[PDB]
């Protein structure tokens, strides 16, 4: 490999100075899950969509859970470090401006940890049904950071209290944080997609 090529991924070269839009699929998805979704969203962002590097007999993800589902913290740290680099490296390559990310479930989770470990990398992030189990140590982000969390209130995978708590954690780094709830489960509602559209409209 090379360094911006560190994940296998789809890409659509955008205008110089325009956002780097990185989108991260859920467990079981891949590089085409979110690609055109976000091409459509930021008509001229440079767009970047990797397939995760862990395979869970078949289903691809961005970091390892043990059997019966508990996150592997060494692998998560490994993957967070890989993502960060991958993003910085493509920033260079396309001469992109703001970095924006969007993730669903497992993908919002790797993205959330980046928000935590590199608090100053992202300008905007949308977390779709995140699950963060631990309590993040808090480092300050950029006052312009904007984050959107979308969540289900009967999501058997994402306990309300943990979403509510991730919310406050990010909110303490600085920037804004907005959570849009729906009754209902792990599914993305059309209402979530709306809020996504309204949220990223500030960026182009």
Active site (annotated) includes residue 155: yes
Beta carbons within 10 angstroms of residue 42's beta carbon: 21
Residue 84 has a CB neighbour count (10 Å cut-off) of 15
Q: Which of 105, 129, 169, 182 is catalytic?
A: 105
55-82 residues labelled b (16+ CB within 10 A) or e (exposed): eeeeebbbbbbeeeeebeeebbeebbeb
DSSP for 152-165 reads ETT-TTS-HHHHHH
Q: Which of 25, 53, 155, 169 is catalytic?
A: 155
Structural method: X-ray
| Structural domains in the chain plus CATH codes | 1-204 (3.40.50.1820)
E strand spans, 132-189: 146-152, 176-182
């Amino acid at each position: 490999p090379m360094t911006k090529d560190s994940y296998f991924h789809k890409s659509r070269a955008g205008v110089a100075g325009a956002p780097l839009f990185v989108l991260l699929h859920g467990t079981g998805g891949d590089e085409n899950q979110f690609f055109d979704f976000g091409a459509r969203l930021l008509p001229q962002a440079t767009i970047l969509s990797p397939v995760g590097d862990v395979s869970e007999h078949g289903a691809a993800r961005f970091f390892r859970r043990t059997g019966e589902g508990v996150y592997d913290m060494v692998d998560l740290e490994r993957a967070t470090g890989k993502m960060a680099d991958f993003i910085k490296a493509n920033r260079e390559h396309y001469q992109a401006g703001p970095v924006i990310g969007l993730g669903f479930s497992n993908g919002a989770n790797i993205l959330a940890n980046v928000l935590i470990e590199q608090p100053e990398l992202f300008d905007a992030a949308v977390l779709m049904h995140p699950l963060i189990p631990f309590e993040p140590k808090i480092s300050p982000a950029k006052p312009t950071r904007r984050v959107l969390i979308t969540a289900g209130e009967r999501d058997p995978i994402c306990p309300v209290q943990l979403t509510k708590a991730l919310e406050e954690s990010l909110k303490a780094q600085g920037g804004t944080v907005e959570t849009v709830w729906h009754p209902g489960g792990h599914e993305i509602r059309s209402g979530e997609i709306d809020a996504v559209r309204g949220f990223l409209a500030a960026y182009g």
